[model samples]
Target: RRCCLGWDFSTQQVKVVAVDAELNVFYEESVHFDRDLPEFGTQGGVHVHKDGLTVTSPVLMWVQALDIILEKMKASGFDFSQVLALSGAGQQHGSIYWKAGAQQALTSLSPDLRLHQQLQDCFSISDCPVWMDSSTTAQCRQLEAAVGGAQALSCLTGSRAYERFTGNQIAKIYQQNPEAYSHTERISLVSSFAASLFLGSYSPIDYSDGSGMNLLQIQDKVWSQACLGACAPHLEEKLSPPVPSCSVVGAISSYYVQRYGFPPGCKVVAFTGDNPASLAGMRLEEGDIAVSLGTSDTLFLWLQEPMPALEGHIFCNPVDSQHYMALLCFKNGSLMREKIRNESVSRSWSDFSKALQSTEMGNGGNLGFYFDVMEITPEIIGRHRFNTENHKVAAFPGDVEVRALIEGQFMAKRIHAEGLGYRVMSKTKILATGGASHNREILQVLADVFDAPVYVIDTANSACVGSAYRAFHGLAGGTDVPFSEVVKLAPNPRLAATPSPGASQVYEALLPQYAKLEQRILSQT
Candidate 1:
């Protein structure tokens, strides 16, 4: 089966790889910042001041990038017409408010020179806040308080009012810059909004992306009216409709066909948030769990039922009714590990892994440590700094001493996983992915903490592969095969790390210390 694909036109580039029914890579190419573009005072025209902060890419850059990617696709020997469908992994929580008839007046930002001038006047800010930007913390706190506080927001939205969430950002704009907020005719999640421009239709946001907005009710799978009242009451009507993640949103526009030389009728599947797409790629299923060790760490567990709200856990699944996904995120997991690895240990990742493997568990000078800087679970923010002591080593070989860093992270995971287990009661195993999964030592630590098996898949780019899988399924006309069957059909596991009896005993003994540290941090807050 022939297929074509596109990624989020945002800064973090993803190239869609189409595969035949036999699962072969037919076409792939990535579009991203040409080092020249950043130097030209236009890092996609959003400007990065020398202060080390990066701004959002201008819309013009996004359209230009998409055009270039399509051209690359054409050069790769695939006819645009033969492309069956286009699906994407979009950065979640961005909102674009376009004028009512703006799309009809200006379709392609690349060729329409006059549209640029018009957009300058229309959009109050050319750079919409990116997902990673957290300048809206004050707004988030205010909205949370207005809505009866963080717990209430979590109960309604399945997550708290985060600084980068669309709801908080919109509320911020409305309060501070009402002129621009009121000029908004439609509010769109970044993925669906971008796809709508390409497809020439107002596409609905898939459940995955919508859930990230902190406005959608998880149980109802729609925007919650009460949430809007509590957050942004005036802009509730501007929200887009919600749709299943795998459903066909619309077909690619004729203009795109004429301009890019692609064939007509390439269906655009509903856009998915990156996390949900990662879940799809990992082939996560009910009772299965996935842990990502990227710039930050994320733990996801699939559930057949909605997990009740916990203090620090977040429950989100693909907007697809076919399955549900529960997630726990650590904003500083990798950063914390890297800080210790770089400054304290002065070791490479491999060397650190080796050191950890060599160290005995619970041998870090008998010190009970908590790396609380920038935590997401337990919902602590703006607090990051390690707490440790200089106690003498209690375990042999100094292997246990070197492995302290790994143990610290594993402890955090244990706290989160146990809390999630208490709420869901079905998560039995964790499928670990991302940068840390490759480390046998880290995987062992995770296994010991969860007291369960830790499995690693063959692919490093699980999220990208999952997005492609969604495109393939979309092209196949939404095959009736169960998602679990699709996962079983896709790939094989490379290795499994089971818990060590010795390590388990050590962790079991130290579990109380970990819990005490957790309570101490929470109590202080």
Candidate 2:
């Protein structure tokens, strides 16, 4: 039988991976988007403003990537005809709208040879609102007031009105460009919209992606009428219906089969946002935790019950009918580390690792650091400023010899992990993924900070692997398969790293000092 594919939008790349019936990885590829696109302005990722906004990339870029992946599968001797189902994780909290019929009216596969021009014509706006752009602060505050306040909004959406969410962006659009908002026929989450383009149908979104939209009711697991009424009543009806994560949304049309040369019966399963798909990737279960360290850091735990109205965390999971997931995000993690490495040390990764090891745990009992970009677990919104600034030296220069920047970042990771640990239940084991886990120094820092063993899988693209697992689950029928069983079905991940016991004790000794530094930073800010 033909297999399904999974896609993830990571910090720097759009990754896709496909697996066969036996859980054999058939194809994997990554496409990088130009970060310097003019339309995106001074911001990065998917952020778009009203006046100088511009769109980058075309539909063909993704299509071409898929084609290359499919070709690779063929090169591996897998019959293309045997592939049957597909699903993917799109970047969450972004908006993509077009005149509904424009996509449907295209009779020929190559109607738009230059897809960027077609996209500009169909989508009036220049840029899509990316998850990282926090320009909608005023809109968030106004909407929160309109909806009764932050507590009310959190109670409904499981999170407050983030500047990057579709709801806030929709409100911004309505206030700024009423005409464009009026002309909008459908407002699709990024994931579902991409699936619609590929499947040639009105693609419905899965609950995982829909949850990112502040319009979705976290308790009811559907679009919130009150939220719609408060935000954009006129366009509320245009929202797509929500489906379970693994349900079959539709089959690929004959047109796609003819153009792409896939089997006729390949079905398109429901799509999810990247982080939720990451839960599936880690095979996260109750008590299990998954940490994705990309440009930002996300800590997700599968909880037995929905956490009671927490400030810095969101209840977003669909591992089962009864349980839910709690997520905490820290914006200053890997990106900060990259800045330190690139600007300060100018050393190779191996040399940096060596420096980290030399510095020892607790930074010689004197130095401490705190990072606060966008705090989720502590519910510290609107506080983008860092709390601690002191760069004190402890025992000797050699003890704290690592550059100030590196020590500062390492301390940030420790603080974040400790903060999350306080809120989340005693985690079974922390499953670490992404580029940071590849460094033994960082993994040791994490393990020591959390006082737990950090499990690192060799694959830097675990999110893709998780997507493959979801595809397999959809194709195999949603049975009660244990996560361990499903993970074992795939190729073995090389065991990468863990924490040193002595370092763990040192971290414990310095916990109070770090806490004091955090207080100093917060008070000063």
Candidate 3:
């Protein structure tokens, strides 16, 4: 049966998934950056600079990873000829700089040599800046100042001046390493960089992934000249143009056809950012929201009309080209909750759940802010709790503290989501994924706090699976079949929990107080 291939160039690993015509993932594989390529001497697949703000990954490490995964697939008797189309995703905002003559090497790669050996000298910079890097504050400020303030920048580029965005990263490279910047011929996001490997040419950044750049004008779906000028000189020459996520960029390169038995006619689809791919993987519909509870929690929702704000991001929808999506990030997610659980619930998730169950919703008008580390949103640190009378309280009982921690987290998500124009309508459904999604009692709080039904799915490899789905959609690209139709055969998420009775009354009253206290904390900070 014909199959579609998907790849994910994630933070710590390169994962691949193959889906058959029925949309079932028949095969999956991964090559961990640290374990498999220890020679790179990377910790968690990245090098944290002494400055404590800059983080980077070796470009050759990512290049070598693809070679390893593909060779393993071939060794496992995987038939590459069955792959009709392919696409991929990558950690958003990570940028790769290609040397002046790299395209010549790319277009003429020899079939017999490994990809790394051939492209070892292709990068203008050995290490590429990634999303975790915060060294671009000056660049971010300069870009924001050049194009008005943060809100104005958000209006143009779907987000404010974030330090991790590709444009600001590029600006830093240009400012600090002018000779390297001058030697650079092309720039690609991690997503486009991965696509370029398969195409044997530079891949155009996809609209969905380009929205993370702080360079692309979100509404126009094109690179903003003002932003380019603000960031660096001759930037447009380096960043070719943006393409639709489902676009068929080119056929598979001859290197793959001759070396790995890939069909010469196999189509290559434009790749997107990991979060956009996850949205596609979940098959999120209108009025649906997805909350990812990981080390850093994420809340995203489909938006027909995006209202880009200073607080969150608005990215192009990967599945629906005409629509949009909004996202919110919280740095103090699982780790902070884990800290509370360890202190109050003895580090047992079961006991944590019991704590959540024992305490009622609202925690009797007590709300807590648990930012063990510096938080991205609101930019506050340390812990602060408030009581029934809105007075600053030092602490609460262990059980009530757990409830406040859980409730406050969900309430923050709701408030910020609403700030980005997300409304919990009658048809609203909240889809939960990641480590915390497995806890039913935790999800019970999520359902109540959002006042919506909660559904859960196995999204361990959502980005890779979503890339496979996009590949299938790319096969039907000529026919203009919608992404939903292409992925309709996939399994549906199970219902986790529903809003308990009186949840709306409890949360509706509590949300305002939470916001007020959150502002209070921010004002103090």
Candidate 4:
């Protein structure tokens, strides 16, 4: 039976999910960065700067991950021969810098050389700046000034200048290491960097991910030359054209045919940002908003048109390039939940679930905000606890803290989503994915907080599944099947958790209190 292979190059690991023509998952594997590849000396998949603001992963580490993940898949008894196509999702805003001769190295990669060995000299910058890096404020200000101001830039690119976006990241490279910038031949986001491995050449950035760069003209769907000039000179050539998400770029490399036994004809479709890929993977329909809780929590809704904003972002849809999506990201998401899970339940998710469910819907009026890291909405730092009456508290009982962590995270998602103009209707379905979505207890909290039905797909990493689905949509010589129809052939997210009538009512009453607490915390910070 013909099969499709999907991969997610996320912040923590490279996750692979393969499915048959029926779109049912057949094989899965995850490669942990810290454990599996300790030689990389990575902590949580990246190296944090001493300044505490800059963060990066070794570029060679990603290349090594590509090799190791494939080996792991092969060892797991997944045959590469039946695979017809390949595509993937990558962490948005993580920029990969290719060395001057990288295209030659990429197109002529040898089967005998493991990926990291072959590409040892291929990256101009040894470390890749990832989404968590927040040290590009100077570059952000520079771009905003060049574009007439932050609002004007937001109107043009669908977002204001942010440190993690590629434009600012690139400016930092050009300023700090002019020689490296000069030696760099191309810049690819993490997604296209993966595509380049399969294509044996630099792959174009999908418009979906390019939107996060603060460089693409949102409506035009092209690199903004004016914005490019503002960041660095002659950057147009270093960047590839952004393509539709489903566009089949080319056949897989002969290196794979020789080394991994992948069918020589297997096609490589364009890869996109993880969120858009998840949007496709979930088969999201009208009035559906996706809540992805992973390294971060993001809320995205399908948009027929673009609505640029200073707070949220608008990007071209992966499924339909002509369309757009609205996104609100909270930087402090799952990790903090894991922190609470560890503190309250002894690092056992099962025990965490038990404690979480034991508490009442509102945690007996106890609420807690956990930001183990810097956050985006209201941009707060550290953790804060509050009593049921919305008064600050030093701490809560173990069970109350567990439930409070669950509620606080979901509550923050709802507040920001509302600010982005997503009005949750009675019938609105909130599709949840990412690692934490596996917990029914956490999903119950999401359902209650959003006051909508919460559905979870069979796979935790839906972005990987979505990548596989894109391969089918972009199959060579096949019908010009639309992504929506192509996705329908795949199964839908099963309705797993539903909120009770009282749960919604209780959360509704607490919404204002949560907002007030968020405001007060931000004001203090």
**Runs of candidate 4 exceeding 4 Å displacement:** 71-77, 293-296, 331-375, 380-412, 425-427, 433-451, 476-479, 497-525
- Please give the CA lDDT of all the candidate structures: 0.64, 0.62, 0.92, 0.85
- Global CA lDDT of candidate 2, please? 0.62
Q: Residue 34 of candidate 1: its Cα lDDT?
A: 50
Q: What is the TM-score of each candidate against the true structure?
A: 0.83, 0.77, 0.96, 0.82
lDDT of residue 246 for candidate 1: 72
Q: Write the residue-wise lDDT of candidate 1 on 375-421 in tens digits.
A: 65765554222323532233323333346556766676666655554
Which digits, one per residue and each the tens of the lDDT, describe model 4 over residues 304-388? Answer: 6555667788888788778778888788877787788788788899989899778888777787888877777658888899986
Among the numbered candidates, top lDDT falls to: 3
Instruction: Quote the lDDT for 354 in model 2.
Output: 70
Candidate 2 residues lying further than 4 Å off, grouped into runs, are 9-15, 30-79, 100-127, 305-315, 331-367, 370-427, 434-436, 458-460, 479-484, 496-513
Sorting all predicted structures by TM-score, with the top scorer first, yields: 3, 1, 4, 2
Tell me the TM-score of model 1: 0.83
Candidate 3 Cα misplacement greater than 4 A, ranges: 477-479
Taking the tens digit of each residue's C-alpha lDDT, what string does model 3 give over 1-525? 899998999999999999999998999999999999999999999999999999999999999999999999999999999999999999999999999999999999999999999999999999999999999899999999999999999999999999999999999999999899999999999999999999999999999999998999988888999999999999999998788787999999999999999999999989999999989888888888999999999888988888898778899888877778988989998888889899999989989999998899889998898998898776889899999999998999999999998899999999888887788889888999989999999999999999999999888889999899888888875337878787887877899999999999999899999999888888886
Off by over 4 Å in 1: 4-6, 34-36, 39-55, 106-125, 261-263, 305-315, 319-323, 335-367, 370-374, 378-398, 421-429, 457-461, 476-480, 501-513
